[PDB]
Paper text:
As such, we found that a circularly permuted variant of a cage-forming enzyme, Aquifex aeolicus lumazine synthase, cpAaLS, assembles into a variety of hollow spherical and cylindrical structures in response to changes in ionic strength. Cryogenic electron microscopy revealed that these structures are composed entirely of pentameric subunits, and the dramatic cage-to-tube transformation is attributed to the moderately hindered 3-fold symmetry interaction and the imparted torsion angle of the building blocks, where both mechanisms are mediated by an α-helix domain that is untethered from the native position by circular permutation. While the wild-type protein, AaLS-wt, self-assembles into a ∼ 16 nm dodecahedral structure composed of 60 identical monomers,35 the negatively supercharged variants AaLS-neg and AaLS-13 adopt expanded 360- and 720-mer assemblies, respectively, constructed entirely from pentameric capsomers. Moreover, a circularly permuted variant of AaLS, cpAaLS(119), forms not only ∼24 nm and ∼28 nm expanded spherical cages, but also straight ∼24 nm-wide tubes of variable length. We previously designed two circularly permuted variants of AaLS and confirmed that their morphologies depend on the positions of the newly generated N- and C-termini. The native terminal amino acids were connected via an octapeptide linker using genetic fusion and new sequence termini were introduced either between residues 84 and 85 or 119 and 120, yielding cpAaLS(84) or cpAaLS(119), respectively.
Numbering used by the authors:
A (entry chain UA), D (entry chain E), E (entry chain B), F (entry chain GC), G (entry chain FC): 14 to 162
B (entry chain TA), C (entry chain A): 3 to 162
The structure:
């Protein structure tokens, strides 16, 4: 409920609904047009990409994601799960799910080593950079569920 | 005599072995997503196989600290053959230094008869106040190539 | 709903996975020694492959603490299919308790169309002053069967 | 039902069925073959070996073993009982019963004294080691009903 | 030189030579017949079975074994090496090398966990027991090069 | 096996068989007709009613009841479970399950507190009196799994 | 919260929903059809019968019953309260209230002060015995929340 898996799922549902309204027909006007996202999950298609490093922690995060979607009227048939060896492959794996026209949002869940002993962690910066660029290029929401040790 | 000692060493858990194992799973996973689909009525889980038969690979490795790089290369080749791969379906490319691994990686990845690329190198003196501009470019460059070409690239350098 | 949670769990490093991986390598190693031989002029190294295609297996598992044993069984089956094995070539046998795993193991190993046997069980209260006569018999019995029949038997119980 | 005798009979009955299934002709195939032992005790001939030390306790255990076989469809005519002067003679007598082609399982019932001595009871080890060895040589289940005290 | 790998190899060379003389023709007599083994390794065939657990320690032990044999006139073409996943498989692997009529001795090299927290280590006792029995049954020397942590 | 839950299942299974035998056509005759209940649990649909007071103890009993039915040939799909806030509601819920034409027996599992008071527990008497009365009116066995403490 | 009025009301809530599900359509099948009730009070009509002897204690008890219904999302308009001279009249009064086609549950509250003497065992027994028979005949839950004293 309070785990980072829950939080990532909530952002996905809101964002998916928001993009539905914007592409719809505009209103008559006469007032400021306020746009906002709903928390209803009916009729949506979702995809989750997760890793295996420290599978103890990652396992419970994925459980949270599935619970949140179904509890908000999400049908189990509309979840596609993909597993990758490690964090380095999350962005490339998320590329193929996003391009599919069936999916509406992608949730990325993972975990990264504490590190902090070197000046910079080069490997840990490409996962964040890669996902952000993919969202703008493909015009689809991608959520960052990565925990840090 | 010294040849026997070198051969006696194990090559089951070195960074090269891990890099090749990650490549085989990703290559098989891609061929599954791009193909057909299931019936339905349940959550659909995708996970790659560990079968290396029928897949063609490409390995790019540098030379600086060739004593350490050479064994990392043997680990990767050993993994492919053990898991059923065919020796005839491997391409090895050697480059001078780490600055110019990504340029070679792109040329291999652009071929229509390659499935994954394993990149092997060594980084020297990672703990230094000066920003290692060379080091950050190798990591950044390989990542961008993977997304553009929609082909996995594995990155198994060892710090030093 | 609860079915999804159970399926979401990973089965990559459990004791069952390790037991099945050890069996595949040993079975392939045996088919190499018993066959042909090399030319010579160098030290001859024998090492098994990790290809599970064409091999028939047999798994024996108990019931006490069936909640834990069941997932260990899934790990072993998952390893075989991932490494290229065929689901049709597996035989599962279930037994009441740990005292009588070895008796079932012998019957499977004596078939001419089985290559290795994976044994899965649970041992309870290993730290006790009384000599667990049941526990020592399971370990001793499986070992003797392996040597007599010249066939590998893997032993992947988990203490508790 | 909570006595060790009832437990011993159940184990023997369903291994007798498992072995009958294994050595028979295989099924159609095309899927994983799973083998299990039913609790039907029709046409199964049993033998029981029982000691006499602390004859009071051992007496009720033997009743449980016979009771279980009759309830589960067993014919009373197909049970053979043997009595031995003590624990040490159980392995020797059990082997004599096992070699008979008109037997499908054997149940060993006995009581062992407390091993308060620093050295493990040599007699205690041999009976466990003997019964186990017999099962492998003759390929026939031999259940273990020894109860400590 | 002083590592346990060296010591195991030395015993193998002596034992292999000893069995050569015993099967030879007997002497005239007139005095006590003293038999003893030589340290000459020419013309012999050797086999080594090693594991991978803690491959750092095991690797140097295997290096010692090869050095000792070659330094005593051992040709490199007459060594066969077999690797197994773990300690549990040493006895069964050593079974196949021994039966081959080409080999004259088998050296077993390995390493076992410190343990000592339970009352007994069941897994660590079968490797020792298995190798000893195999030597008597097959009538061939097998050396125990297992280190303990 | 020694828990009251295993005992309750056995009683229910073999009355379900007895009633199936009685209402069927009679035998040839010419001798005394003796009716008995087999332990085969094929094609028998069961219902279980379980309380929640002291949920720890009641939890393991229900596992025994389900375990017994599957071992004796029962299909897991043919069991219906109902949970009630306490002991007082067992008779009322049991009657609802009993009237279904797709049920052949019912098992009542519960725990009752000690009757240390001088007056007998009125709640304790009613559940025994209620379940017994139901069996006669509806002509369907209702096993009694209540365990005192 | 800590008064028997609390518990009686809480139990009634669970039982009301439980019966609604059972009479309704079953589940998708293919597994154990576990049934259970929730604490959703909305949409339910209740009724309370409370005595008048020792109104001091009874008054607070009936107040506790009110708190559950309003607190758990039950309208204050559906509660129906009926008062009677004493404990002897609770059964017959509850029968009339229960038989109404709208009242979906009933609660009883009282104090059996005279239970300290065996002479009251006659009147004491009937009230608990009577309410039990009402529920079975009419097939509708009737909670029993009296206090002994």
């Amino acid at each position: 409920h309070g785990n980072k898996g829950w939080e990532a799922a909530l952002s996905a549902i809101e964002m998916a609904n928001l993009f539905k309204s914007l592409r719809g027909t505009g209103g008559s006007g006469s007032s400021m047009e306020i746009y906002e996202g709903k928390l209803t999950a009916e009729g949506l298609r979702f995809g989750i990409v997760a890793s295996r490093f420290n599978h103890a922690l990652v396992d419970r995060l994925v459980e949270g994601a599935i619970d949140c979607i179904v509890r908000h009227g999400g049908r189990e048939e509309d979840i596609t799960l993909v597993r990758v060896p490690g964090s380095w492959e999350i962005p490339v794996a998320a590329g193929e799910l996003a391009r599919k026209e069936d999916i509406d949002a992608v949730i990325a869940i993972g975990v990264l080593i504490r590190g902090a002993t070197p000046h910079f962690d080069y490997i840990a910066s490409e996962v964040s950079k890669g996902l952000a660029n993919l969202s703008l290029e493909l015009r689809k929401p991608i959520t960052f569920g990565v925990i840090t040790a």
